[PDB]
Every structure is written in structure tokens, then in C-alpha cells.
Design a protein around this ligand. Structure first.
Ligand SMILES: [Mg+2]
Ligand SMILES: [Mg+2]
Lengths: 354, 350
């Protein structure tokens, strides 16, 4: 199909939003902007420090854009946490997105990973040096259990990026590969566990609800990111691997059948997320609900996903799905579409030369 | 109770055509003793005896169960490798049985780690101190997988202490927890010692083996230990029991789902690795058949109590289980007195 499944894509997206009850929040634009600027400002000063500028090899423009996309993701989906927590998570998730830009083989820098770690010597891989040095700022907002989940998920992520340098979709017939990889690079347990600051949640008292949230949120969060990204990756000949593309290669099926699997898995996860938490601790279901809505709003408003294009193509159309979609899209824009000039300034590079 | 258990075992053993031609009696014994002997001297050291709070009797039984597992499944690795792995997997089995809350000793996990201070939790203190003896056998990628899987496992035991089978409707919980405490990437990666495999040359094959072997291994173990669990189920929270609670299905449907996954997993393991590097295929097969032999023979899985209460048929079922249980017993049934000696306690006391 040299043609993007617009009708199909519209149907699945709409059903998703209905399933989760995509709606309005008491999260006002003024509030969004206060948080966006706050998280961005702290993170920008952090990455402009000389040490960060030195060990972190990233093109300034790509770093600028990666940060802006992460602050938006965190401020929008982690609506219930403090400003400091939004800012610290913003730094952490920016480090993870940036590692994706590296092509350097980790092998030589991991030869002594364990012994250095055990001995307390700075890690040879500069990414780990920066990330572990900064980790305490993130972990101070959480209890021991949630902290362990963040630490594990970030280690899994490092391995995920190592594996991806091989641009490997999986051996035909290796059915377990696709999801094995998506979970490795998903940060599912990092996200899931980072939603529960010890400041407003008691880890020990809500252990079972948190653990369940982590387990269920892992798959929802990544599957939704895959679905929403399916448009920008469709004609991207540079990106050769993804959950859907690997389904195609590893399971030996069509892109349509791979998209079908993703869409069914995504809806089943949404339906079950609601069915499980719609009657547990209120604050928990609130964080969970704000995350699902925020996450979707972020995908719809960030130009990285180019969803404005699909909107603009079915803007004036009589079909049911199209209208439902546009209304949703329009909703998101009302609270989500904010000019970067209102919060993302000054540029990281500017603060860097100072 | 079920005798159906025989069905969803025969189907498996039959599909993989279970045949453990690994080792010769003399070889199995030689490795079992070497492995046991090094591990035994390690766990009998004063520092180990002190920080590792375990009843001697349990330690003794756990060590023998693991040495068997390792020697029987990691058939192509050196004697030293089997020994060091036996020590590591014995530490994991011990933590699995612990009841001491991790919470208070994990409060400063990261800061102590980053600073290079001994961890507060005694298990971590020992396992991390010993870890290099295991890692020296592998390249950086495999080592990372062992480290991650062991960390995941620690979290799995933490969660397990809540005897929670998941909220009804939480379809993702059962497998989430199983992978967490399954040591899948630890097993899958510990199969490729740098001594005989090149981590860079076979990156893709190894990565694929870890992904596929993670599920085959855990699923096969779940199936084989269904008896040992349903029976004296001291409020257990196994994969099968969690499928029932979370997916809201009969114990039968659950056990049926597991076997189907296991069959499919076995199918794909062959389809993918048959025509690939022969040395890789060899190690994979030796693990699969060896792993089965160990389940059929090791006391821990009480599959004997089932052999004797089923000797009464001659078809394709019931007589198939006994037929297999016999094949396994021939090569795998070895008297502990031939390798597991002297007792850890004896070495410890001296
Ligand atoms: Mg990709
Ligand atoms: Mg346990």
C-alpha cells in the first residue's frame, strides 16, 4: 500500500479516544505554560553547563528540539506531579531520547561496566557518566520500589539502543523478537513508576495498584506511541525498524496485518486499563487518566508526529470517523497548541556560550 | 489434581521429540561433582554463612537442585563456567524463598551503588561481590543481560512477597510478573561464554536466542512444575494461577494457554535456528533437552510421585509420560552420594 490507511487509521484512533474517554481537564493554558517554561528553563540551564556540553555529543539544534519535545511530553502527561518533578523527569527523558542519536558502538565502553559500577568509578561511556551523576535528582522524588523500576528501565533502554544500532527487524520466524525489543527500548517501567511521587503517594500502601499500573501502562504507553507514530514512519525510508515493521519481518505478515495486531492490542489495553482502575483509589485513577489524555494530546500537538497533516486532509469531510477525529484534534489544539516562544527560551546554545 | 497434566506434557515432549543424548553417565557425574564442589566451598565460607540467612538443610537442597539444573542444561560450557553459574543461580533460588522485606534495605540502593559502598541488603552484598566470577566468562553485551535479569529478578521477588495474583481484568500482569522473576535474559545470555562464542560475530543470533529462549525456558518450567505447585500450593501465585485470577478463566483454560504458547515457542525455536550457525543450534538443543531431563529427575519437581500412580496404560498418553519419565531417569537419575559431598555444613563447620 503506497497509500496511508487514512480511513482505517481514522477509525482506530477515534475508537482509542472513545475507549479512554479523551476529554477536557482542569489543566488550563496558563498552567500549561507556567509548567512548560519552568521545566524547560531548569533543563535548559542543566544542558548548557560545560560538563554536559562536553560529554553529551549531540547537534545543538537536535538537542534543542529533543528537549522541547520532552518537556511537552512530561508537562502534558505528568499533570499531577510538582514542577520540580516535571523538570527533573524532563532532563532524564531528554538524556534517553538523545542516546538514540548515537551510532558509537557501546562494546568497548561496556567491557568494564560492572567492575567500575561496583567500585564506584565513573563509567567509561560518557552517557552513563552524565545520566548516573544526574539520576539522584530524579530518584529523590520517589520511594525505593519506584526508584528500582526507573533504574532497571533505564538500563533496559541502554541495551535497547545497543541492539538497534544493528537495524535488525528480527529473523523471519522469530515471533518473540518484536515485542521483546519494544519493551527493551520502551521505558515502560520508567514512565509507569515515575507517575507516583512519594510526596503524594504511599508506595507501600498502594503497592498493588502501582505494580498493576506499571504492568498495564507499559504496554498502553508504547502501543499508543507506535499507533500515533505510524503516520510519520509510513514513508520514512530512514527508519527501517519499529514494532509494526518488525512484526512484518519477524512474523512474515503484511503491513496491514501488522497494523491490525497493533490496533487490536492497543484497544484491548485501553479497555482493560479503564475496567481495572475506574474503581480504585481516586488519586491513582486521576494520575492514570491524566496521563492517558495528556500523552494523546501531546502526540496530537507535537509537530514531530505531523498529525496536523491528516487533520488538514479530512478537515471538511462528511464521514463519521473524520468528523469525530477533527473534533478530537480540535479539542487537543485548544489546550495543547502553544507557541514555543511562550515558554521555550532562551535557546540552550545561548545559555551555553554565556 | 488432574491426569490431563499427562496430556499437556506428552504433547510437549512429543513435539520437541525429547531425547537427552547430552553427556555420558561418567561425564554427568564428573561435572555434577566439579560444580557442586566449588559452590559448596564457596557457600561454606564464614562471610557467606553469616550474611546469607538460610537454614542449612534448605541451602544444601537448593545447591544440589541448581548444580543439577546448570550441569544438565549448560552442557557445552567449561567446568568452571558451570560452577560459577551454579553459585549465581543458587543465590537466586535462595532469595526466591526469602521472606525478609527488601524495602528498608533498598532505600539507599542507588546512592550506595553510585558511591561504591556495600549495599545494605545482604543478598546484594554477596551477589555483587561474587558477580565478577560469573562475568569473566562473558563479553560486555552478555554481561549486561545477566546484570539486568538479576536486577529484574530481585524486583520480582519483592513483588512476589505480596502474594498478589493480579486484579481481575489485568490481562498484562501475569506475564509481566513472570518475565520479571523468570531470569530469562540471564539464562539466555549465560549460554554464550566468550571462550567459545564471539559476542560481536553472533550478536544477532545471541540477541535472538535471548528473546526466544526467555519464553521457552520460563513456559517449559511453568508447565513441568504445575504438579509441584497446584498440590502443596501454600497460597501460590504462579503464571497459571495468575492467568485464572487476572484473565478470569478456568484452571484448565489457563493450563491450555500455557501449553499452546510452549508448543508454538518450540516450533519457532527450530524454524529459526535450524539452518543457522551449527554451534549455536547445538547449545540451544542441549539446553532444551537437558532442561527437560532435569525437570523430570530432580526431586524438587516431584514428578516421581506421578510416575507411580500412572503406570497402567499403553496408548499415546499415560504410557507416553511413563515412557519418557523412564528415558530421562536412565541418563538423568544419579544418586547424590556420587557427587554432592561433603555437605555444605561440614565444610562450613571445620
Ligand atoms: Mg525506528
Ligand atoms: Mg518467591
Amino acid at each position: 500500500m503506497e497509500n496511508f490507511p487514512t480511513e482505517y487509521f481514522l477509525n482506530t484512533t477515534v475508537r482509542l479516544l472513545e475507549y479512554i474517554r479523551y476529554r477536557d481537564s482542569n489543566y488550563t493554558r496558563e498552567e500549561r505554560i507556567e509548567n512548560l517554561h519552568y521545566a524547560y528553563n531548569k533543563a535548559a540551564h542543566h544542558f548548557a553547563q560545560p560538563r554536559q556540553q562536553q560529554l553529551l555529543k549531540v547537534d545543538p539544534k537536535r538537542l534543542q528540539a529533543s528537549l522541547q519535545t520532552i518537556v511537552g511530553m512530561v508537562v502534558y502527561s505528568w499533570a499531577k506531579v510538582s514542577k520540580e518533578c516535571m523538570a527533573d523527569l524532563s532532563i532524564h527523558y531528554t538524556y534517553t531520547l538523545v542516546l538514540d542519536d548515537s551510532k558509537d558502538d557501546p562494546y568497548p565502553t561496556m567491557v568494564n561496566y560492572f567492575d567500575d559500577l561496583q567500585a564506584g568509578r565513573e563509567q567509561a561511556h560518557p552517557w552513563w557518566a552524565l545520566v548516573n551523576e544526574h539520576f539522584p535528582n530524579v530518584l529523590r522524588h520517589f520511594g525505593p520500589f519506584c526508584s528500582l523500576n526507573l533504574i532497571r528501565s533505564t538500563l533496559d533502554f541502554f541495551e535497547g539502543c545497543w541492539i538497534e544500532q544493528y537495524n535488525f527487524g528480527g529473523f523471519p520466524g522469530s515471533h518473540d523478537y518484536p515485542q521483546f525489543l519494544r519493551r527493551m527500548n520502551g521505558l515502560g517501567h520508567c514512565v509507569g513508576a515515575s507517575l507516583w511521587p512519594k510526596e503524594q503517594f504511599n508506595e507501600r500502601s498502594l503497592f498493588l495498584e502501582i505494580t498493576s499500573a506499571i504492568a498495564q501502562m507499559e504496554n498502553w504507553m508504547v502501543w499508543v506511541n507506535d499507533l500515533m507514530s505510524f503516520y510519520k514512519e509510513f514513508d520514512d525510508e530512514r527508519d527501517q525498524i519499529s514494532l509494526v515493521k518488525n512484526y512484518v519481518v519477524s512474523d512474515e505478515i503484511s503491513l496491514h496485518e501488522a497494523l491490525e495486531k497493533l490496533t487490536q492490542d492497543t484497544l484491548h489495553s485501553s479497555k482493560q486499563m479503564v475496567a481495572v482502575f475506574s474503581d480504585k483509589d481516586p488519586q491513582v485513577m486521576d494520575t492514570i487518566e491524566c496521563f492517558m489524555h495528556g500523552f494523546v494530546t501531546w502526540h496530537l500537538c507535537d509537530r514531530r508526529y505531523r498529525l496536523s497533516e491528516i487533520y488538514e486532509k479530512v478537515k471538511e469531510e462528511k464521514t463519521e470517523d473524520a468528523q469525530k477525529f477533527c473534533k478530537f484534534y480540535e479539542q487537543a489544539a485548544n489546550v495543547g497548541a502553544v507557541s514555543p516562544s511562550e515558554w521555550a527560551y532562551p535557546p540552550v546554545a545561548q545559555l551555553a556560550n554565556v
